[PDB]
Nucleic acid binder design. Structure first.
Ligand SMILES: [Li+]
Ligand SMILES: [Li+]
Length: 135
RNA sequence: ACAUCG
DNA sequence: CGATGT
């Protein structure tokens, strides 16, 4: 119904899918960029969306912040809830990096606690999520 | 179908 | 138009 302006919004961007993947997190209220991941040579949209949420969780926990996270990704929200990124991407030498980060993100989820609400950004009603790459 | 990525 | 996902 109502946007929770006191929140962190995350989103993936890519060049190709599979292709070059990056992600960022922004203050929903101001659009200030709070973190940005160095481009990863090969990954999928959903792997990047998953990493972005998990990085948001870690970012907020380190800062003792109870703010929620907005994501526009039905897939990644579920993967985080399950603590399991069910990606179809082949595991080979050229995808090793993204899969290492995904495996490490799952490992973090399985060794830490959080209460952060992970909320669906309602693009149809509210427009593009504030972290969108506008591509 | 729904949610995304280009 | 194509790919990633539930
Ligand atoms: Li997105
Ligand atoms: Li986006």
């Amino acid at each position: 119904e109502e946007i929770i302006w006191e929140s962190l919004s995350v989103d993936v961007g890519s060049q190709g899918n599979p292709g070059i993947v990056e992600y960022k997190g922004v203050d929903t209220k101001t659009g200030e960029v709070l973190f940005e991941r160095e481009p990863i040579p090969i990954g999928t949209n959903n792997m990047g969306e998953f990493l972005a949420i998990v990085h948001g969780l870690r970012y907020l926990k380190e800062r003792n912040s109870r703010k929620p996270i907005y994501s526009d990704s039905q897939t990644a929200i579920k993967w985080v809830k399950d603590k399991k990124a069910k990606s179809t991407l082949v595991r080979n030498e050229e995808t090793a990096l993204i899969w290492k980060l995904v495996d490490e993100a799952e490992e973090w989820l399985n060794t830490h606690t959080y209460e952060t609400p992970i909320l669906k950004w309602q693009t149809d009603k509210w427009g593009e999520i504030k972290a969108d790459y506008g591509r």
